[PDB]
Amino acid sequence: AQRVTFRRRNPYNTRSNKIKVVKTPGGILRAQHVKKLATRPKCGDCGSALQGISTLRPRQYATVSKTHKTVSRAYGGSRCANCVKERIIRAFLIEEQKIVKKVVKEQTEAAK
Amino acid sequence: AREITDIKQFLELTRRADVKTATVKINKKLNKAGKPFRQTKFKVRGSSSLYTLVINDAGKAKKLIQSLPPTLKVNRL
Amino acid sequence: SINQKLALVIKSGKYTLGYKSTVKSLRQGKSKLIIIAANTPVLRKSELEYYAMLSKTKVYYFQGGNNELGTAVGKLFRVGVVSILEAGDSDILTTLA
Amino acid sequence: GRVIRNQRKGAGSIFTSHTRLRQGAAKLRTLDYAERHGYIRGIVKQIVHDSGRGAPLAKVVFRDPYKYRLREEIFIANEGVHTGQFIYAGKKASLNVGNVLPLGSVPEGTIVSNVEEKPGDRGALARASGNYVIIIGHNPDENKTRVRLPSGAKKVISSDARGVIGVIAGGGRVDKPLLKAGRAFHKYRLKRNSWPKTRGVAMNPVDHPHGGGNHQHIGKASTISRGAVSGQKAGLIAARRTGLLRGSQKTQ
Amino acid sequence: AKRTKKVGITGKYGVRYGSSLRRQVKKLEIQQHARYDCSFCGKKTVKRGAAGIWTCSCCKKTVAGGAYTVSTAAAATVRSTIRRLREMVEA
Amino acid sequence: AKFLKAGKVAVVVRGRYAGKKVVIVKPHDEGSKSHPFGHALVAGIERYPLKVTKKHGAKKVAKRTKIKPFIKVVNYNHLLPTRYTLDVEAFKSVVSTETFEQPSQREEAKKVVKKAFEERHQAGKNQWFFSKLRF
RNA sequence: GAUGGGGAAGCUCCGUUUCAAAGGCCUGAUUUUAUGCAGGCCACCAUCGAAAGGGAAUCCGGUUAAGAUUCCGGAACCUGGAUAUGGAUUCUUCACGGUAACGUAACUGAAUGUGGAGACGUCGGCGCGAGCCCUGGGAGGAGUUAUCUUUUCUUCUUAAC
RNA sequence: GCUUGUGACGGCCCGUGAAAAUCCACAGGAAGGAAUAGUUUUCAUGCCAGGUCGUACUGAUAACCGCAGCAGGUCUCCAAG
RNA sequence: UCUAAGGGUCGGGACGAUCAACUUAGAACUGGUACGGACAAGGGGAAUCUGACUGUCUAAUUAAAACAUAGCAUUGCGAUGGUCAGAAAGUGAUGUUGACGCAAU
Ligand SMILES: CN[C@@H]1[C@@H](O)[C@@H](O[C@@H]2[C@@H](O)[C@H](O[C@H]3O[C@H](CN)CC[C@H]3N)[C@@H](N)C[C@H]2N)OC[C@]1(C)O
Ligand SMILES: CN[C@@H]1[C@@H](O)[C@@H](O[C@@H]2[C@@H](O)[C@H](O[C@H]3O[C@H](CN)CC[C@H]3N)[C@@H](N)C[C@H]2N)OC[C@]1(C)O
Ligand SMILES: [Mg+2]
Ligand SMILES: [Mg+2]
Ligand SMILES: [Mg+2]
Ligand SMILES: [Mg+2]
Ligand SMILES: [Mg+2]
Ligand SMILES: [Mg+2]
Ligand SMILES: [Mg+2]
Ligand SMILES: [Mg+2]
Ligand SMILES: [Mg+2]
Ligand SMILES: [Mg+2]
Ligand SMILES: [Mg+2]
Ligand SMILES: [Mg+2]
Ligand SMILES: [Mg+2]
Ligand SMILES: [Mg+2]
Ligand SMILES: [Mg+2]
Ligand SMILES: [Mg+2]
Ligand SMILES: [Mg+2]
Ligand SMILES: [Mg+2]
Ligand SMILES: [Mg+2]
Ligand SMILES: [Mg+2]
Ligand SMILES: [Mg+2]
Ligand SMILES: [Mg+2]
Ligand SMILES: [Mg+2]
Ligand SMILES: [Mg+2]
Ligand SMILES: [Mg+2]
Ligand SMILES: [Mg+2]
Ligand SMILES: [Mg+2]
Ligand SMILES: [Mg+2]
Ligand SMILES: [Mg+2]
Ligand SMILES: [Mg+2]
Ligand SMILES: [Mg+2]
Ligand SMILES: [Mg+2]
Ligand SMILES: [Mg+2]
Ligand SMILES: [Mg+2]
Ligand SMILES: [Mg+2]
Ligand SMILES: [Mg+2]
Ligand SMILES: [Mg+2]
Ligand SMILES: [Mg+2]
Ligand SMILES: [Mg+2]
């Protein structure tokens, strides 16, 4: 039955005025301003939300230790690792198949 | 803003550096199922955080109050 | 037809279906020949290719999709790669293959 | 007396294109050594919707020849171009849907899109959804190419001018009935302020030429000469004919 | 039970707009919503959004299509006249 | 054939060593009570040696040749067999079930594998194994 | 909307990266000495424009005739800067571990390139959270009580971090 | 249950629904770095600083606009049985 | 004043024990025949004229049959262009555009 008011001079229901309602040690209801829920980062290859990485808003990532912001494998805080596994097979196979094609020139060179 | 388990670490904290003041709280608390018991809380005011140690039984408590050095100004309750 | 050979391999012979198992075959070498559905991606092609050259297993490219090469084994789903384990009654590998 | 609506438009207070949401200005690669001599490869990264455009867009990233960096371009996606396809640019690229070749480097009968009017202008003709041009013959001496445009007119251009194989995606939009005003409303929300239109005869003669009268009527021939004057020109303007078109179209 | 004799997806427009236009739309709304087979992963998980743009539910392949259907007549009959045209310069 | 055998080089496809080339040593074709699955035992290269050039000085080359190894149990499924091969030799005894489970053996094992790889690298025997795979 | 510019008798009009020689930083090199020369970068070219858009960080209790997320008591947080001790790293120099997904109290990184977050419609049902609503036991307080009603009402709370 | 937040989904489009500051990370390998000891601030603990302007109250059948303590007009949050 | 149906959670060397709700239907009895008891809450039908429709306008005498719309048709234009702006410009709108486009009826 208690009714509550905003705590900041913005009266309007915008993104930045989100309000949690709370009961304090006083025993009364009081508004409290919530920030905007920060979004999980995305693998820059596939786009899926990449695990092992803490999800905060971007200037919070400067206040946190690095074992949050990467994971132990190459391209740790970047790609989703089935996509890095992709970069593994594809790299190797393409750099291999290159030699085959450099060989097969050296055949058709003097064998044409 | 932190709670402490280790009794030893607590001691190295009570003598630590910039810690000029501590405090000790005593609460009536009912043990386990039935009875009451004397709970005692050790609060050490650090330059950043207030570390606090809860000694459940008064035995470890009684001997720890002695473990507190002088020049640490300890408000009793 | 190249499809009808599989009809015999399937009833009278031994086979496995799908990439994860057709690598296990080529690794253990248990596969004589694997067949690839035309639409499957080239990274998987090169892999299944390169896994085969290391196992000295021939590979024929099925002209068609996975929903077809799956019907061609008489199974109601799609399959990209069939690994031929034990040739059946059919002539199979001794062929154009 | 007054200033008629089409007159007011060249000032562009309210009449400017509604531009905020648009992916960018869709253009070809700049013509450089690679394209005019060899080929160069890029992957279309994603294909995407432009606002106020009927055609989808392909974002195509290439590598920068003279500096290490990736240079992304905005192409009008021809139909069948897909994310992850490699696109090839310039003369020695092969002839496949989506690549970009000089007009000289294709045979006659090729159907090609976003072609330049002059070589290097980064593309002009047939950028609308579903449109395209056809090459009819070349003239290897003073290398020229004749092409049939979407309007049907045929044009001589330079064979160094490029254009991209295939047809633009998103063909068929103009068949589906708009079916109500809202669909027409939002259609022009993201275009420019053209809608709706008030009929010049519904107005008063200060407002329009067609304005005025105790009956709604035009009162003089609605066809207006080329040599007419600003605020005289509203109607069928320099019309060579008029009336319902009977018989076939498709000129020579 | 079957619900509408004729209108189908067009029953949304009720009585409005006249029957021709309603049907004339019905064809294209049914074309544009359909699930289509995917040239890549071989599944019927292709579907539209943003006319001219068709993606696969899985496999995430995305192809520039027709407005209300994936492959438009003029497209493929252009594409095959391209195939035939390069063979000339293959041979 | 069965390309899983001693000398074979592979590329690790996962697990923090991903992208680095390992040589197999002790393939266990089928399982174990711990690791019930087909797994090799590989001596890999973690930190590759760097590029060297005619103008690279005395200790510069003495620095740039150092090589950080690693010794890993690998699921076969997490290996990508390369056609290339490097003959095990000195580390046949080094890399074993016993070496793992206690660090003291791994550390010395890595020490051997260290001297092993550098020695084969200088005098560029098996050039591919020390050329970093880049992706 | 300044500027090199181009119009205009002129008040001024146009143009905002435009026919423009459009600069600013990281390090050394000084050991005349304070900062010239050595590089290699980067060429991205005013500025104004949101007290509802974007955005670094605080809460509870108490207090005034009137002020409070501003004072007071207590417990925090961000940013800029200074810095010392512990811990960690290494004779295999730049941490180990798990098959893997990943773990972690740390666990060097310049030019340059890339990736993510800033960062985004609407409607529908379905899941969950807080706060509000109803309510049983008991512990207090107040009301009704000719009759009735283990009854009516009320307190039973928990902030950021 | 009601307010509100959030999640995974589905419908809709010839509509497919901002920008920038900013912050983190990946790639790379310049360079610098140990043994009588060298390395580190993305771990812990500690030391200093945080200016300038606004902050009262009305916000409406009397504190605003309509000549007024005018039945008009003026954006929004909370919402018990 | 009753009856019936519609659930949760347990353990198994055929069911039992247990927690929790306000829906629905049915049956009795009962009354000054009353009962959506206040409040709340469509009048219905047949036709002619006219605009298809939702939408719009004369603030302060007109809300309509007038405007708009989807739809139908017609006209101009391939950029050295159409339409349109400025006293002029080395200036501008359409135009982040290109005939499935823009402009004019
Ligand atoms: C006692 N509280 C802390 C004290 O522990 C210490 O904390 C620093 C902290 O400020 C640094 O953090 C700071 O610097 C980072 C970049 N170097 C970015 C984030 C920023 N908060 C930490 N990286 C290291 C701590 N020892 O220095 C700052 C402080 C506030 O005095
Ligand atoms: C724009 N709405 C107008 C509204 O302004 C008003 O118009 C009157 C107009 O009729 C009166 O004018 C009338 O009477 C005048 C005196 N006999 C002469 C002109 C005649 N039109 C003028 N006094 C102006 C408006 N207040 O009433 C008529 C209207 C059309 O509704
Ligand atoms: Mg306030
Ligand atoms: Mg309050
Ligand atoms: Mg992590
Ligand atoms: Mg901190
Ligand atoms: Mg974590
Ligand atoms: Mg006039
Ligand atoms: Mg460009
Ligand atoms: Mg039509
Ligand atoms: Mg308008
Ligand atoms: Mg009209
Ligand atoms: Mg008209
Ligand atoms: Mg009139
Ligand atoms: Mg006139
Ligand atoms: Mg008239
Ligand atoms: Mg008329
Ligand atoms: Mg008329
Ligand atoms: Mg006239
Ligand atoms: Mg039906
Ligand atoms: Mg030299
Ligand atoms: Mg100016
Ligand atoms: Mg500003
Ligand atoms: Mg703001
Ligand atoms: Mg702030
Ligand atoms: Mg007050
Ligand atoms: Mg450690
Ligand atoms: Mg950078
Ligand atoms: Mg609301
Ligand atoms: Mg969307
Ligand atoms: Mg790195
Ligand atoms: Mg600690
Ligand atoms: Mg106030
Ligand atoms: Mg107030
Ligand atoms: Mg009033
Ligand atoms: Mg007043
Ligand atoms: Mg006044
Ligand atoms: Mg009755
Ligand atoms: Mg009645
Ligand atoms: Mg009546
Ligand atoms: Mg009636």
Ligand SMILES: [Mg+2]
């Ligand atoms: Mg009407």
Ligand SMILES: [Mg+2]
């Ligand atoms: Mg309505």
Ligand SMILES: [Mg+2]
């Ligand atoms: Mg209006």
Ligand SMILES: [Mg+2]
């Ligand atoms: Mg009126």
Ligand SMILES: [Mg+2]
């Ligand atoms: Mg009306």
Ligand SMILES: [Mg+2]
């Ligand atoms: Mg009609």
Ligand SMILES: [Mg+2]
């Ligand atoms: Mg002219």
Ligand SMILES: [Mg+2]
């Ligand atoms: Mg012109």
Ligand SMILES: [Mg+2]
């Ligand atoms: Mg002209």
Ligand SMILES: [Mg+2]
């Ligand atoms: Mg057409």
Ligand SMILES: [Zn+2]
């Ligand atoms: Zn990924």
Ligand SMILES: [Zn+2]
């Ligand atoms: Zn697919």
